[PDB]
């Protein structure tokens, strides 16, 4: 249970990590930018999250 | 302490440039900021870059 | 050439400088889009404890 809970809790915490994007919340990238600038920023979060 | 319709600046033909570095400019009409700070000055053209 | 630099303080804290958005009545206990002070998403809104 501890190994699964440490594996899930780290997987969840990593949603909040930047990977070099202007925000670790996707709706902040979408609200502050147009698509030509968003695809440079979202690909950071995809490359990281994945 | 105010409401900022950025389109008033963004549609203005007076500007030689409208550079943005953490947003794309139409979104300035949708966002909300805790403060804005306007640094203001006059400079030669070959160093506006 | 006149230059002005508009530095922004993002929503780390209670927001003030808003975009010209006609705000609305608030739904509860139903699935809705939301925009509070530019903090957008989708969810079900309820009274807290």
UniProtKB/Swiss-Prot annotation, chain C:
Effect of residue 12 to P: Increased resistance to human covalescent sera neutralization
Top-level taxon: Viruses
Region of interest called Disordered, as start-end residue ranges on this chain: 12-34
Functional summary from the UniProt entry: Attaches the virion to the cell membrane by interacting with host receptor, initiating the infection. The major receptor is host ACE2. When S2/S2' has been cleaved, binding to the receptor triggers direct fusion at the cell membrane. When S2/S2' has not been cleaved, binding to the receptor results in internalization of the virus by endocytosis using host TFRC and GRM2 and leading to fusion of the virion membrane with the host endosomal membrane. Alternatively, may use NRP1/NRP2 and integrin as entry receptors.
Subunit structure: Binds to host ACE2. RBD also interacts with the N-linked glycan on 'Asn-90' of ACE2. Cleavage of S generates a polybasic C-terminal sequence on S1 that binds to host Neuropilin-1 (NRP1) and Neuropilin-2 (NRP2) receptors. Interacts with host integrin alpha-5/beta-1 (ITGA5:ITGB1) and with ACE2 in complex with integrin alpha-5/beta-1 (ITGA5:ITGB1). May interact via cytoplasmic c-terminus with M protein. May interact (via N-terminus) with host bilirubin and biliverdin, thereby preventing antibody binding to the SARS-CoV-2 spike NTD via an allosteric mechanism.
Name of protein: Spike protein S1
Gene source species: Severe acute respiratory syndrome coronavirus 2
